[PDB]
Amino acid sequence: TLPTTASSSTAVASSQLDQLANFAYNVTTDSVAGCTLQNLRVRRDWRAFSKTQKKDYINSVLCLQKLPSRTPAHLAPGARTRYDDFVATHINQTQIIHYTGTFLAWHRYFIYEFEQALRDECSYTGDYPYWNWGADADNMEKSQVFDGSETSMSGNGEYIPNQGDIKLLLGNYPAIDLPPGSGGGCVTSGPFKDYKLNLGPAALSLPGGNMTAAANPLTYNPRCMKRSLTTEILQRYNTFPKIVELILDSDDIWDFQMTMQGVPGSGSIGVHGGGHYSMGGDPGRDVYVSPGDTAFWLHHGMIDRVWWIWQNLDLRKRQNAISGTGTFMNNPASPNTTLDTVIDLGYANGGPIAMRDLMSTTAGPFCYVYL
Numbered sequence: 001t002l003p004t005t006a007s008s009s010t011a012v013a014s015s016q017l018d019q020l021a022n023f024a025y026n027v028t029t030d031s032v033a034g035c036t037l038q039n040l041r042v043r044r045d046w047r048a049f050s051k052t053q054k055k056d057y058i059n060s061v062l063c064l065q066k067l068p069s070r071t072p073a074h075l076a077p078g079a080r081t082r083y084d085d086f087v088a089t090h091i092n093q094t095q096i097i098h099y100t101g102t103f104l105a106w107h108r109y110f111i112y113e114f115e116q117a118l119r120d121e122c123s124y125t126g127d128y129p130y131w132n133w134g135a136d137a138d139n140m141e142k143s144q145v146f147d148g149s150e151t152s153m154s155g156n157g158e159y160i161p162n163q164g165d166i167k168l169l170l171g172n173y174p175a176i177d178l179p180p181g182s183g184g185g186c187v188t189s190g191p192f193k194d195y196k197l198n199l200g201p202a203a204l205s206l207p208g209g210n211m212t213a214a215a216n217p218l219t220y221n222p223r224c225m226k227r228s229l230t231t232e233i234l235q236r237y238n239t240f241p242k243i244v245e246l247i248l249d250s251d252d253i254w255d256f257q258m259t260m261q262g263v264p265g266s267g268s269i270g271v272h273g274g275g276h277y278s279m280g281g282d283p284g285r286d287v288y289v290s291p292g293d294t295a296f297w298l299h300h301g302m303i304d305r306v307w308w309i310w311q312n313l314d315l316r317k318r319q320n321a322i323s324g325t326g327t328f329m330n331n332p333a334s335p336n337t338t339l340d341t342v343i344d345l346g347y348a349n350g351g352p353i354a355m356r357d358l359m360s361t362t363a364g365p366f367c368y369v370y371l
């Protein structure tokens, strides 16, 4: 007897999520029992990682931020590292990978190939980590992902008093206004304290309402990563009731992906936008450059988990479900996304791949589950 309606207590909504996760696990292992049970990988909550396991993942990311970039210098003058290769492709394709029929599948392929770079070029042998927003929604500063310790993705940025609010515009919908959080400047501590963003900004929202952008966001612009942790954003968008509501109240792929990213004109930015903007800073508030924030990978692990749960609740109808076009909010208009639509990650990793081969975590190149 699966839940059918999200509960309003955090604690009960948390148990609903575990139960839906358990069901999705059962369905995926059954379809696997070449992806086999023996080589089925498990992705896990960052809280399940030991201190050594956390440090092994962080070290591999740091390795990727030193190894030289494969992107041709003339196509992206500012790229220096393999990590930059992933940021660059995301900047370059942002207009066709968000609010499109490809949004969920493209990002599944994106983070998988990031994982492959960690394993093949940086000797990583651990599990892929995800960030469970619901456990941190009441105090982001205490998240194991963001607490600033040697096992965080670094923490908060240096505090900047009396910051203006954040104003979010999209088309000519009424603006959405957010608090600026408790940071503002360069991250003060953690393993990514000396790490440099090399690309962007491309569309960086600033406290006060301004939006700054480099003339060419692919030219060299080394600078610190900035954060402004904003618990209030997670409290409104990323709580366990909000997570379960997205899963249970969405009956088709259109409503699922739209509620996740935020329905334009609803005043809500969804679990996707909520998780992004709660980091604040740079590139936390830049849609194009967001992979520059090292927590991007854990945030989209959770995005992919929530999609994988939703898929497995009715696999016959939801496994291959696609809706939307090839352009951001279909502006300008483009043909519908289908299973023959091909996507690629540029020079980041991998090669071109059709939507058909991306829809299941245990087919095509994929062989994993979430616990």
Ligand SMILES: *[C@@H]1O[C@H](CO)[C@@H](O[C@@H]2O[C@H](CO)[C@@H](O[C@@H]3O[C@H](CO[C@H]4O[C@H](CO[C@H]5O[C@H](CO)[C@@H](O)[C@H](O)[C@@H]5O)[C@@H](O)[C@H](O[C@H]5O[C@H](CO)[C@@H](O)[C@H](O)[C@@H]5O)[C@@H]4O)[C@@H](O)[C@H](O[C@H]4O[C@H](CO)[C@@H](O)[C@H](O)[C@@H]4O)[C@@H]3O)[C@H](O)[C@H]2NC(C)=O)[C@H](O)[C@H]1NC(C)=O
Pocket (backbone or CB within 6 Å): 075, 076, 088, 089, 092, 093, 218, 346, 347, 352
């Ligand atoms: C931002 O995003 C955009 C959009 O994605 C991106 O632009 C892409 O830009 C890259 C480079 O900047 C492009 O990659 C190059 O494409 C060259 C042209 O390739 C096409 O046409 C070839 C010619 O086809 C004709 O001639 C042949 C032979 O005479 C004939 O048989 C055909 O019928 C046709 O008439 C064709 O060969 C090629 O196809 C092969 O490869 C593609 C995958 O690339 C594959 O899908 C095909 O099935 C086929 O196997 C393709 O159709 C190409 O020459 C060039 O090659 C480089 O790499 C190869 C090794 O792979 C080297 O051998 C070669 O010498 C070159 O160094 C390269 O592939 C890409 O096509 C663009 N894509 C789009 C959609 O526009 C930007 O780069 C992004 N910006 C940033 C910063 O990331």
Ligand SMILES: *[C@@H]1O[C@H](CO)[C@@H](O)[C@H](O)[C@H]1NC(C)=O
Pocket (backbone or CB within 6 Å): 019, 020, 022, 023, 026
């Ligand atoms: C998962 O499968 C096990 C074994 O068949 C079963 O005992 C359990 O109740 C299932 N859980 C859910 C949530 O379906």
Ligand SMILES: *[C@@H]1O[C@H](CO)[C@@H](O)[C@H](O)[C@H]1NC(C)=O
Pocket (backbone or CB within 6 Å): 323, 324, 336
């Ligand atoms: C595009 O998809 C919608 C469903 O989302 C469908 O109603 C419409 O007919 C499709 N358009 C074309 C040209 O196939």
Ligand SMILES: *[C@H]1O[C@H](CO)[C@@H](O)[C@H](O)[C@@H]1O
Pocket (backbone or CB within 6 Å): 008, 009, 010, 011, 134, 137, 138, 235, 239, 240
């Ligand atoms: C439990 O806590 C969440 C925040 O984590 C609230 O949104 C919920 O209403 C309940 O108080």
Ligand SMILES: Oc1cccc(O)c1
Pocket (backbone or CB within 6 Å): 098, 272, 273, 276, 277, 283, 284, 285, 286, 287, 288, 290
């Ligand atoms: O795709 C997105 C959406 C919202 C904020 C962000 O940094 C990225």
Ligand SMILES: [Cu+2]
Pocket (backbone or CB within 6 Å): 090, 097, 098, 107
């Ligand atoms: Cu993206």
Ligand SMILES: [Cu+2]
Pocket (backbone or CB within 6 Å): 272, 276, 290, 300
């Ligand atoms: Cu995202």
